PDB file of C-alpha atoms in Angstrom:
ATOM      1  CA  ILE A   1      76.395  62.391 137.249  1.00  0.00           C
ATOM      2  CA  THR A   2      73.266  64.868 136.801  1.00  0.00           C
ATOM      3  CA  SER A   3      74.526  68.068 136.046  1.00  0.00           C
ATOM      4  CA  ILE A   4      72.291  70.906 135.706  1.00  0.00           C
ATOM      5  CA  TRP A   5      72.387  74.917 134.242  1.00  0.00           C
ATOM      6  CA  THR A   6      70.575  78.184 134.462  1.00  0.00           C
ATOM      7  CA  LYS A   7      68.818  78.184 131.575  1.00  0.00           C
ATOM      8  CA  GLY A   8      70.144  80.194 128.581  1.00  0.00           C
ATOM      9  CA  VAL A   9      73.738  79.042 129.423  1.00  0.00           C
ATOM     10  CA  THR A  10      75.810  77.105 127.980  1.00  0.00           C
ATOM     11  CA  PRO A  11      78.291  75.539 129.744  1.00  0.00           C
ATOM     12  CA  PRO A  12      81.646  75.536 129.467  1.00  0.00           C
ATOM     13  CA  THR A  13      84.036  72.740 128.773  1.00  0.00           C
ATOM     14  CA  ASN A  14      87.757  73.968 129.085  1.00  0.00           C
ATOM     15  CA  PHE A  15      88.200  73.070 133.088  1.00  0.00           C
ATOM     16  CA  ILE A  16      91.731  73.532 133.473  1.00  0.00           C
ATOM     17  CA  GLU A  17      93.707  73.262 137.108  1.00  0.00           C
ATOM     18  CA  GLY A  18      94.539  77.010 138.523  1.00  0.00           C
ATOM     19  CA  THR A  19      96.076  78.681 141.616  1.00  0.00           C
ATOM     20  CA  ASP A  20      92.483  78.646 142.645  1.00  0.00           C
ATOM     21  CA  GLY A  21      91.291  74.876 141.706  1.00  0.00           C
ATOM     22  CA  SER A  22      89.516  74.021 138.450  1.00  0.00           C
ATOM     23  CA  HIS A  23      88.612  76.678 136.712  1.00  0.00           C
ATOM     24  CA  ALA A  24      87.544  77.690 132.666  1.00  0.00           C
ATOM     25  CA  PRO A  25      88.342  80.549 131.139  1.00  0.00           C
ATOM     26  CA  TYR A  26      85.974  83.457 130.304  1.00  0.00           C
ATOM     27  CA  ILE A  27      84.453  83.208 126.927  1.00  0.00           C
ATOM     28  CA  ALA A  28      81.813  86.026 125.934  1.00  0.00           C
ATOM     29  CA  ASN A  29      77.882  85.258 124.491  1.00  0.00           C
ATOM     30  CA  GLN A  30      77.656  82.090 126.502  1.00  0.00           C
ATOM     31  CA  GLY A  31      75.057  83.042 128.087  1.00  0.00           C
ATOM     32  CA  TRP A  32      77.214  83.280 131.677  1.00  0.00           C
ATOM     33  CA  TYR A  33      78.884  86.652 132.801  1.00  0.00           C
ATOM     34  CA  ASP A  34      82.025  87.241 135.142  1.00  0.00           C
ATOM     35  CA  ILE A  35      82.038  90.914 136.945  1.00  0.00           C
ATOM     36  CA  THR A  36      85.383  91.616 138.150  1.00  0.00           C
ATOM     37  CA  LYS A  37      86.715  93.915 140.496  1.00  0.00           C
ATOM     38  CA  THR A  38      89.350  96.445 139.977  1.00  0.00           C
ATOM     39  CA  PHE A  39      90.182  96.491 143.605  1.00  0.00           C
ATOM     40  CA  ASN A  40      90.420 100.657 142.847  1.00  0.00           C
ATOM     41  CA  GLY A  41      89.513 101.274 146.490  1.00  0.00           C
ATOM     42  CA  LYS A  42      85.497 101.458 145.696  1.00  0.00           C
ATOM     43  CA  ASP A  43      84.746  98.164 144.345  1.00  0.00           C
ATOM     44  CA  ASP A  44      86.833  96.291 147.304  1.00  0.00           C
ATOM     45  CA  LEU A  45      83.682  95.213 149.486  1.00  0.00           C
ATOM     46  CA  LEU A  46      80.994  95.063 145.894  1.00  0.00           C
ATOM     47  CA  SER A  47      80.748  91.334 145.365  1.00  0.00           C
ATOM     48  CA  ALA A  48      77.273  91.514 146.203  1.00  0.00           C
ATOM     49  CA  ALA A  49      76.996  93.931 143.662  1.00  0.00           C
ATOM     50  CA  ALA A  50      79.344  92.116 140.955  1.00  0.00           C
ATOM     51  CA  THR A  51      77.112  89.200 141.551  1.00  0.00           C
ATOM     52  CA  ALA A  52      73.880  91.257 141.037  1.00  0.00           C
ATOM     53  CA  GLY A  53      75.345  92.693 137.965  1.00  0.00           C
ATOM     54  CA  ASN A  54      75.952  89.433 136.560  1.00  0.00           C
ATOM     55  CA  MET A  55      72.490  88.206 137.134  1.00  0.00           C
ATOM     56  CA  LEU A  56      70.928  91.008 135.667  1.00  0.00           C
ATOM     57  CA  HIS A  57      73.206  90.779 132.246  1.00  0.00           C
ATOM     58  CA  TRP A  58      71.861  87.440 132.035  1.00  0.00           C
ATOM     59  CA  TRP A  59      67.844  89.460 132.786  1.00  0.00           C
ATOM     60  CA  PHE A  60      68.811  91.700 129.456  1.00  0.00           C
ATOM     61  CA  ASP A  61      69.442  88.138 127.708  1.00  0.00           C
ATOM     62  CA  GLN A  62      66.301  86.782 129.202  1.00  0.00           C
ATOM     63  CA  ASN A  63      64.271  89.732 128.308  1.00  0.00           C
ATOM     64  CA  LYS A  64      65.988  91.737 125.314  1.00  0.00           C
ATOM     65  CA  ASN A  65      62.928  92.586 122.735  1.00  0.00           C
ATOM     66  CA  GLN A  66      61.279  93.068 125.831  1.00  0.00           C
ATOM     67  CA  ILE A  67      63.796  95.634 126.880  1.00  0.00           C
ATOM     68  CA  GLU A  68      64.071  97.207 123.815  1.00  0.00           C
ATOM     69  CA  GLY A  69      60.951  97.854 122.990  1.00  0.00           C
ATOM     70  CA  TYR A  70      60.136  99.272 126.760  1.00  0.00           C
ATOM     71  CA  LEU A  71      62.571 102.045 126.277  1.00  0.00           C
ATOM     72  CA  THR A  72      61.750 103.126 123.164  1.00  0.00           C
ATOM     73  CA  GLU A  73      57.976 104.153 124.533  1.00  0.00           C
ATOM     74  CA  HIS A  74      59.810 105.168 127.798  1.00  0.00           C
ATOM     75  CA  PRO A  75      63.035 106.935 126.588  1.00  0.00           C
ATOM     76  CA  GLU A  76      62.661 109.160 130.116  1.00  0.00           C
ATOM     77  CA  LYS A  77      63.793 105.352 131.733  1.00  0.00           C
ATOM     78  CA  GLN A  78      66.650 104.828 129.913  1.00  0.00           C
ATOM     79  CA  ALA A  79      68.829 107.280 131.754  1.00  0.00           C
ATOM     80  CA  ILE A  80      69.287 107.710 135.392  1.00  0.00           C
ATOM     81  CA  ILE A  81      69.700 111.567 135.794  1.00  0.00           C
ATOM     82  CA  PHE A  82      69.441 113.349 139.032  1.00  0.00           C
ATOM     83  CA  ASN A  83      71.462 116.047 140.733  1.00  0.00           C
ATOM     84  CA  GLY A  84      71.814 117.507 137.292  1.00  0.00           C
ATOM     85  CA  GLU A  85      74.091 114.749 136.731  1.00  0.00           C
ATOM     86  CA  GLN A  86      73.761 111.965 134.081  1.00  0.00           C
ATOM     87  CA  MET A  87      74.504 108.725 136.309  1.00  0.00           C
ATOM     88  CA  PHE A  88      73.799 106.210 133.749  1.00  0.00           C
ATOM     89  CA  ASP A  89      72.526 104.678 130.832  1.00  0.00           C
ATOM     90  CA  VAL A  90      70.727 101.658 130.286  1.00  0.00           C
ATOM     91  CA  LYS A  91      71.939 101.027 126.465  1.00  0.00           C
ATOM     92  CA  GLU A  92      75.936 101.692 127.709  1.00  0.00           C
ATOM     93  CA  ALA A  93      75.517  98.758 130.078  1.00  0.00           C
ATOM     94  CA  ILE A  94      73.871  96.049 127.161  1.00  0.00           C
ATOM     95  CA  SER A  95      75.972  96.840 124.743  1.00  0.00           C
ATOM     96  CA  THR A  96      78.904  96.378 127.444  1.00  0.00           C
ATOM     97  CA  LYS A  97      77.703  93.712 129.387  1.00  0.00           C
ATOM     98  CA  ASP A  98      79.828  90.853 128.025  1.00  0.00           C
ATOM     99  CA  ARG A  99      83.186  93.088 129.579  1.00  0.00           C
ATOM    100  CA  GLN A 100      84.772  91.595 132.758  1.00  0.00           C
ATOM    101  CA  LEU A 101      86.212  94.945 134.554  1.00  0.00           C
ATOM    102  CA  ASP A 102      85.120  97.754 132.206  1.00  0.00           C
ATOM    103  CA  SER A 103      81.382  96.672 132.432  1.00  0.00           C
ATOM    104  CA  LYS A 104      79.161  99.880 132.051  1.00  0.00           C
ATOM    105  CA  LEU A 105      76.788  98.281 134.634  1.00  0.00           C
ATOM    106  CA  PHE A 106      79.530  97.529 137.151  1.00  0.00           C
ATOM    107  CA  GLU A 107      80.767 100.716 136.651  1.00  0.00           C
ATOM    108  CA  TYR A 108      77.765 102.596 137.797  1.00  0.00           C
ATOM    109  CA  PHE A 109      77.202 100.664 141.024  1.00  0.00           C
ATOM    110  CA  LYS A 110      81.052 100.917 141.945  1.00  0.00           C
ATOM    111  CA  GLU A 111      81.153 105.006 141.142  1.00  0.00           C
ATOM    112  CA  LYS A 112      77.593 106.084 141.146  1.00  0.00           C
ATOM    113  CA  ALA A 113      75.298 103.650 143.181  1.00  0.00           C
ATOM    114  CA  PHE A 114      77.599 102.643 145.862  1.00  0.00           C
ATOM    115  CA  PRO A 115      80.854 104.149 145.806  1.00  0.00           C
ATOM    116  CA  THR A 116      82.013 104.833 150.030  1.00  0.00           C
ATOM    117  CA  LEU A 117      80.093 101.716 150.798  1.00  0.00           C
ATOM    118  CA  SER A 118      83.726  99.828 150.569  1.00  0.00           C
ATOM    119  CA  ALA A 119      85.356 102.583 152.848  1.00  0.00           C
ATOM    120  CA  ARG A 120      82.071 102.472 155.631  1.00  0.00           C
ATOM    121  CA  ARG A 121      82.526  98.837 155.539  1.00  0.00           C
ATOM    122  CA  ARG A 122      79.433  98.209 154.449  1.00  0.00           C
ATOM    123  CA  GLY A 123      77.978  95.596 151.808  1.00  0.00           C
ATOM    124  CA  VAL A 124      75.008  95.094 150.208  1.00  0.00           C
ATOM    125  CA  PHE A 125      71.975  92.284 149.227  1.00  0.00           C
ATOM    126  CA  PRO A 126      72.171  90.788 145.419  1.00  0.00           C
ATOM    127  CA  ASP A 127      68.278  90.983 145.785  1.00  0.00           C
ATOM    128  CA  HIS A 128      68.338  94.172 147.210  1.00  0.00           C
ATOM    129  CA  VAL A 129      70.626  95.759 144.149  1.00  0.00           C
ATOM    130  CA  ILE A 130      68.281  93.730 141.801  1.00  0.00           C
ATOM    131  CA  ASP A 131      65.242  95.116 143.720  1.00  0.00           C
ATOM    132  CA  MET A 132      66.953  98.215 143.556  1.00  0.00           C
ATOM    133  CA  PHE A 133      67.684  98.541 139.632  1.00  0.00           C
ATOM    134  CA  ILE A 134      64.636  97.020 138.148  1.00  0.00           C
ATOM    135  CA  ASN A 135      61.431  97.875 140.024  1.00  0.00           C
ATOM    136  CA  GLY A 136      63.101 100.847 142.286  1.00  0.00           C
ATOM    137  CA  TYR A 137      62.693  99.923 145.318  1.00  0.00           C
ATOM    138  CA  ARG A 138      64.925 102.011 147.867  1.00  0.00           C
ATOM    139  CA  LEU A 139      67.653  99.912 148.892  1.00  0.00           C
ATOM    140  CA  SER A 140      68.694 100.122 152.854  1.00  0.00           C
ATOM    141  CA  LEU A 141      72.156  99.117 153.876  1.00  0.00           C
ATOM    142  CA  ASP A 142      70.542  98.338 157.530  1.00  0.00           C
ATOM    143  CA  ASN A 143      68.213  95.689 155.989  1.00  0.00           C
ATOM    144  CA  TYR A 144      68.886  92.085 156.879  1.00  0.00           C
ATOM    145  CA  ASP A 145      65.516  90.924 155.683  1.00  0.00           C
ATOM    146  CA  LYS A 146      63.556  90.865 152.049  1.00  0.00           C
ATOM    147  CA  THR A 147      62.999  93.976 150.017  1.00  0.00           C
ATOM    148  CA  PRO A 148      59.335  95.529 151.709  1.00  0.00           C
ATOM    149  CA  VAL A 149      56.939  94.484 149.077  1.00  0.00           C
ATOM    150  CA  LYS A 150      54.847  98.463 149.367  1.00  0.00           C
ATOM    151  CA  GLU A 151      54.237 101.031 147.145  1.00  0.00           C
ATOM    152  CA  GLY A 152      57.085 103.410 148.154  1.00  0.00           C
ATOM    153  CA  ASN A 153      58.964 106.303 146.415  1.00  0.00           C
ATOM    154  CA  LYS A 154      61.257 105.036 143.126  1.00  0.00           C
ATOM    155  CA  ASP A 155      65.280 104.940 144.085  1.00  0.00           C
ATOM    156  CA  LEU A 156      66.558 107.538 142.362  1.00  0.00           C
ATOM    157  CA  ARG A 157      69.745 105.003 141.478  1.00  0.00           C
ATOM    158  CA  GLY A 158      67.273 102.438 139.700  1.00  0.00           C
ATOM    159  CA  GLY A 159      63.565 101.693 138.702  1.00  0.00           C
ATOM    160  CA  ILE A 160      64.631 101.707 135.336  1.00  0.00           C
ATOM    161  CA  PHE A 161      62.027  98.818 134.180  1.00  0.00           C
ATOM    162  CA  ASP A 162      59.399  99.752 137.215  1.00  0.00           C
ATOM    163  CA  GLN A 163      56.756 101.288 134.740  1.00  0.00           C
ATOM    164  CA  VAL A 164      56.273  97.303 134.324  1.00  0.00           C
ATOM    165  CA  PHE A 165      57.534  95.885 137.372  1.00  0.00           C
ATOM    166  CA  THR A 166      55.608  98.099 139.901  1.00  0.00           C
ATOM    167  CA  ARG A 167      56.250  98.454 143.845  1.00  0.00           C
ATOM    168  CA  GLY A 168      53.751  96.888 146.439  1.00  0.00           C
ATOM    169  CA  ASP A 169      53.145  94.174 143.937  1.00  0.00           C
ATOM    170  CA  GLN A 170      54.452  91.323 144.752  1.00  0.00           C
ATOM    171  CA  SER A 171      53.546  89.413 141.429  1.00  0.00           C
ATOM    172  CA  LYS A 172      56.371  92.534 140.281  1.00  0.00           C
ATOM    173  CA  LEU A 173      58.950  91.311 142.619  1.00  0.00           C
ATOM    174  CA  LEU A 174      61.582  89.261 140.531  1.00  0.00           C
ATOM    175  CA  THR A 175      63.939  88.267 143.616  1.00  0.00           C
ATOM    176  CA  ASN A 176      63.965  85.520 146.124  1.00  0.00           C
ATOM    177  CA  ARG A 177      66.354  84.861 149.177  1.00  0.00           C
ATOM    178  CA  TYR A 178      67.331  81.689 151.795  1.00  0.00           C
ATOM    179  CA  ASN A 179      68.881  81.535 154.579  1.00  0.00           C
ATOM    180  CA  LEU A 180      71.084  78.101 154.259  1.00  0.00           C
ATOM    181  CA  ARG A 181      72.787  78.460 157.328  1.00  0.00           C
ATOM    182  CA  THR A 182      69.316  76.478 159.053  1.00  0.00           C
ATOM    183  CA  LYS A 183      69.202  73.888 156.092  1.00  0.00           C
ATOM    184  CA  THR A 184      71.331  70.518 155.900  1.00  0.00           C
ATOM    185  CA  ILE A 185      73.167  68.799 152.675  1.00  0.00           C
ATOM    186  CA  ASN A 186      69.692  67.327 151.520  1.00  0.00           C
ATOM    187  CA  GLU A 187      67.262  70.562 152.125  1.00  0.00           C
ATOM    188  CA  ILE A 188      69.851  72.762 150.089  1.00  0.00           C
ATOM    189  CA  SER A 189      70.652  70.614 147.030  1.00  0.00           C
ATOM    190  CA  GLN A 190      67.034  69.940 146.378  1.00  0.00           C
ATOM    191  CA  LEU A 191      65.906  73.764 146.954  1.00  0.00           C
ATOM    192  CA  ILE A 192      68.915  74.764 144.407  1.00  0.00           C
ATOM    193  CA  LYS A 193      67.812  72.045 141.629  1.00  0.00           C
ATOM    194  CA  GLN A 194      64.312  73.364 142.031  1.00  0.00           C
ATOM    195  CA  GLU A 195      65.238  77.207 141.246  1.00  0.00           C
ATOM    196  CA  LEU A 196      67.895  75.830 139.072  1.00  0.00           C
ATOM    197  CA  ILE A 197      65.350  74.140 136.840  1.00  0.00           C
ATOM    198  CA  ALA A 198      62.757  76.471 137.069  1.00  0.00           C
ATOM    199  CA  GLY A 199      65.139  78.731 134.822  1.00  0.00           C
ATOM    200  CA  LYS A 200      66.031  80.902 138.001  1.00  0.00           C
ATOM    201  CA  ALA A 201      69.665  82.500 138.126  1.00  0.00           C
ATOM    202  CA  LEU A 202      71.694  81.584 141.349  1.00  0.00           C
ATOM    203  CA  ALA A 203      73.300  83.958 143.747  1.00  0.00           C
ATOM    204  CA  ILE A 204      75.122  81.897 146.654  1.00  0.00           C
ATOM    205  CA  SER A 205      76.735  83.690 150.162  1.00  0.00           C
ATOM    206  CA  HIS A 206      78.851  81.969 152.272  1.00  0.00           C
ATOM    207  CA  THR A 207      81.904  83.041 154.946  1.00  0.00           C
ATOM    208  CA  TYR A 208      84.880  85.272 153.702  1.00  0.00           C
ATOM    209  CA  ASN A 209      87.851  86.656 155.452  1.00  0.00           C
ATOM    210  CA  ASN A 210      85.983  89.939 156.268  1.00  0.00           C
ATOM    211  CA  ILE A 211      84.020  89.422 159.373  1.00  0.00           C
ATOM    212  CA  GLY A 212      81.353  92.219 158.670  1.00  0.00           C
ATOM    213  CA  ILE A 213      80.651  91.710 154.849  1.00  0.00           C
ATOM    214  CA  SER A 214      79.793  87.595 153.299  1.00  0.00           C
ATOM    215  CA  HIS A 215      81.105  87.343 150.376  1.00  0.00           C
ATOM    216  CA  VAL A 216      78.569  86.099 146.952  1.00  0.00           C
ATOM    217  CA  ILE A 217      79.105  84.660 144.099  1.00  0.00           C
ATOM    218  CA  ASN A 218      77.294  83.744 141.035  1.00  0.00           C
ATOM    219  CA  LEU A 219      75.883  80.044 140.675  1.00  0.00           C
ATOM    220  CA  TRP A 220      75.209  78.957 137.390  1.00  0.00           C
ATOM    221  CA  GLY A 221      75.648  75.233 137.529  1.00  0.00           C
ATOM    222  CA  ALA A 222      75.410  72.141 140.014  1.00  0.00           C
ATOM    223  CA  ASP A 223      76.239  68.404 139.912  1.00  0.00           C
ATOM    224  CA  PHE A 224      73.987  66.631 141.633  1.00  0.00           C
ATOM    225  CA  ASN A 225      75.052  62.580 142.717  1.00  0.00           C
ATOM    226  CA  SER A 226      72.922  59.376 143.207  1.00  0.00           C
ATOM    227  CA  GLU A 227      70.877  60.666 146.158  1.00  0.00           C
ATOM    228  CA  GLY A 228      70.211  63.796 144.613  1.00  0.00           C
ATOM    229  CA  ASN A 229      72.805  65.726 147.082  1.00  0.00           C
ATOM    230  CA  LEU A 230      74.880  68.522 145.759  1.00  0.00           C
ATOM    231  CA  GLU A 231      78.423  66.934 144.646  1.00  0.00           C
ATOM    232  CA  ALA A 232      79.842  70.382 143.357  1.00  0.00           C
ATOM    233  CA  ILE A 233      78.647  73.884 141.908  1.00  0.00           C
ATOM    234  CA  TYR A 234      80.321  76.565 138.971  1.00  0.00           C
ATOM    235  CA  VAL A 235      80.536  79.631 140.025  1.00  0.00           C
ATOM    236  CA  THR A 236      82.006  83.125 139.177  1.00  0.00           C
ATOM    237  CA  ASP A 237      83.657  85.295 141.488  1.00  0.00           C
ATOM    238  CA  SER A 238      84.295  88.683 141.714  1.00  0.00           C
ATOM    239  CA  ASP A 239      87.258  88.708 143.542  1.00  0.00           C
ATOM    240  CA  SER A 240      88.858  86.032 141.197  1.00  0.00           C
ATOM    241  CA  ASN A 241      90.822  87.992 138.445  1.00  0.00           C
ATOM    242  CA  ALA A 242      89.611  87.863 134.464  1.00  0.00           C
ATOM    243  CA  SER A 243      91.881  84.943 133.409  1.00  0.00           C
ATOM    244  CA  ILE A 244      89.849  82.467 135.743  1.00  0.00           C
ATOM    245  CA  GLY A 245      86.166  82.326 134.865  1.00  0.00           C
ATOM    246  CA  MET A 246      84.083  79.850 136.387  1.00  0.00           C
ATOM    247  CA  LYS A 247      85.187  77.918 139.066  1.00  0.00           C
ATOM    248  CA  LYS A 248      84.428  74.180 140.020  1.00  0.00           C
ATOM    249  CA  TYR A 249      83.813  74.454 143.967  1.00  0.00           C
ATOM    250  CA  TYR A 250      82.907  71.185 146.104  1.00  0.00           C
ATOM    251  CA  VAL A 251      79.700  71.574 148.440  1.00  0.00           C
ATOM    252  CA  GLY A 252      79.741  69.116 151.534  1.00  0.00           C
ATOM    253  CA  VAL A 253      79.242  69.266 155.530  1.00  0.00           C
ATOM    254  CA  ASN A 254      82.357  70.029 157.079  1.00  0.00           C
ATOM    255  CA  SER A 255      83.595  68.828 160.907  1.00  0.00           C
ATOM    256  CA  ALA A 256      81.621  71.310 162.163  1.00  0.00           C
ATOM    257  CA  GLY A 257      78.165  70.357 160.225  1.00  0.00           C
ATOM    258  CA  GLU A 258      77.599  73.333 158.513  1.00  0.00           C
ATOM    259  CA  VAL A 259      77.465  72.823 155.059  1.00  0.00           C
ATOM    260  CA  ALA A 260      80.256  74.659 153.255  1.00  0.00           C
ATOM    261  CA  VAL A 261      82.243  75.133 149.444  1.00  0.00           C
ATOM    262  CA  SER A 262      85.766  75.678 148.193  1.00  0.00           C
ATOM    263  CA  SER A 263      88.106  75.111 145.573  1.00  0.00           C
ATOM    264  CA  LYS A 264      89.127  71.742 147.251  1.00  0.00           C
ATOM    265  CA  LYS A 265      87.471  68.632 148.720  1.00  0.00           C
ATOM    266  CA  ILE A 266      86.014  69.296 152.183  1.00  0.00           C
ATOM    267  CA  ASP A 267      87.879  67.151 154.638  1.00  0.00           C
ATOM    268  CA  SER A 268      88.798  67.664 158.537  1.00  0.00           C
ATOM    269  CA  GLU A 269      92.166  69.558 157.105  1.00  0.00           C
ATOM    270  CA  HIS A 270      89.876  71.541 154.984  1.00  0.00           C
ATOM    271  CA  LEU A 271      86.582  72.919 156.781  1.00  0.00           C
ATOM    272  CA  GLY A 272      85.596  74.708 153.843  1.00  0.00           C
ATOM    273  CA  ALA A 273      83.375  78.442 152.913  1.00  0.00           C
ATOM    274  CA  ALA A 274      80.116  77.645 155.210  1.00  0.00           C
ATOM    275  CA  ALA A 275      76.940  78.853 152.909  1.00  0.00           C
ATOM    276  CA  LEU A 276      75.309  81.885 154.476  1.00  0.00           C
ATOM    277  CA  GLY A 277      72.603  82.999 151.773  1.00  0.00           C
ATOM    278  CA  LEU A 278      70.825  81.712 148.443  1.00  0.00           C
ATOM    279  CA  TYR A 279      69.385  84.355 146.531  1.00  0.00           C
ATOM    280  CA  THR A 280      67.482  83.955 143.075  1.00  0.00           C
ATOM    281  CA  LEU A 281      66.653  85.896 140.065  1.00  0.00           C
ATOM    282  CA  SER A 282      63.551  85.097 137.829  1.00  0.00           C
ATOM    283  CA  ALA A 283      63.522  86.294 134.178  1.00  0.00           C
ATOM    284  CA  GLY A 284      59.740  87.244 134.658  1.00  0.00           C
ATOM    285  CA  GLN A 285      59.414  87.100 130.597  1.00  0.00           C
ATOM    286  CA  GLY A 286      55.764  85.935 131.575  1.00  0.00           C
ATOM    287  CA  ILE A 287      55.506  89.297 133.306  1.00  0.00           C
ATOM    288  CA  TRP A 288      55.404  91.288 130.526  1.00  0.00           C
ATOM    289  CA  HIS A 289      52.395  89.058 129.443  1.00  0.00           C
ATOM    290  CA  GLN A 290      50.026  89.421 132.453  1.00  0.00           C
ATOM    291  CA  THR A 291      48.347  92.602 133.438  1.00  0.00           C
ATOM    292  CA  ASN A 292      44.863  93.469 133.399  1.00  0.00           C
TER     293      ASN A 292
END
């Protein structure tokens, strides 16, 4: 009965029943993004990096003018260039943020940043990715905690906007994570609601079919009932093909008593996918104006 959506995101309305479930096809310039995998081998396990990408594309919206100003003053930072390669151009990503399959940012992530990750059966965490790209924090594949906030070497695969968003300053770290596995429906519900009303972009993780790596999706919207508990969430999915777009997931407490999500209602025949983690991204619009 009450629905809340991410700052800068116009709610889709074109919801139809699909093979997965209720989905509204993607349309560009609506605030939300749907980076999707080509399953070319290099990106088969990068759902977190696609999720991260989505939130970055949203970040590029919320800070457009701020960004283009920064880049004309910091042209050096415009490209990612080491080893004698030109690995990435940030201006290309912004030009192509609206594209789903061929988005020049996701192209960077799968082809240059984490190419060998899927063959190694390893993934990343969305926050780690964003913290690498923006602040230039070195990403570890074996880090199961938040990014260590300390002054450190720039990750060569990131730090585009690290002349503003520095390392070793809590004020400059834009991301946040919460373990959902230790919480019940009530606490998770309110937790999503606060972060969403606080104009943050949301990414949720859950158990997939792979035993090593969790799946991660973008949480754009959320429906809450009388009680203030999550009734349903609206998400994009890297693994879902481009024709799907915004999916409606039901949220409930399963037989096992874990909070879970699925394309269909949670029942006894439908255990759902248990929610593992929540990752948030602030737009950091105020950050550009707090340095002295």
